[PDB]
Assembly symmetry: none
């Protein structure tokens, strides 16, 4: 139902808003069923995999947040440093009070 | 309870969503569904809920899952704008609900 064309548009808009440099900007997105993960990234395949099973629950704004969180790890590394938090709060201002709980709950065991 | 509480939550969500029109036709089945949470057969008015994750669902999580499925009876199989708005009105926190549920199920 949720086509790869809107998904690719959301990814491209989030990369642009985050001003990801040339190599960090070379990322694909693909729909694949996952194992209790909203999203994951294959750093070698240079692909963000969004879970096919939970994709019907996701609004465009929810996808944008999930992709921004993942994309910001490409830019800043594996930790939620101050610059990570600031950039995510700039893209999502009305999420100040829930931001850290959400990003912490997006990491696997 | 457990199966009784699910039936109570289904009946309360149908009423809340104003889908009282042929509530008796709305059925729910517990079946193992791999890594899916739920599905709905619109032609048979049957909701399928994953047996594997059902023990770990809170009343609020069940309510959200069932409301999502029941909204397909009202708007059709596509998540049109009205679907999204209604679900966001009932669950202003639906983004956190889903993220905390997936995290909980992964840990479990
Ligand atoms: Cl089925
Ligand atoms: Zn749906
Ligand atoms: Zn993170």
């Amino acid at each position: 139902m949720k086509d790869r064309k809107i998904l690719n548009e959301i990814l491209s808009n989030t990369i642009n808003e985050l001003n990801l440099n040339d190599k960090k900007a070379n990322i694909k997105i693909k729909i694949k069923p996952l194992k209790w993960k909203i999203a994951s990234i294959s750093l070698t395949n240079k692909t963000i995999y969004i879970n096919k099973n939970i994709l019907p629950y996701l609004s465009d704004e929810e996808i944008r947040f999930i992709l921004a969180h993942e994309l910001l790890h490409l830019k800043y590394g594996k930790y939620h440093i101050n610059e990570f938090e600031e950039e995510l709060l700039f893209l999502f201002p009305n999420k100040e009070a829930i931001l850290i709980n959400l990003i912490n709950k997006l990491h696997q065991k």
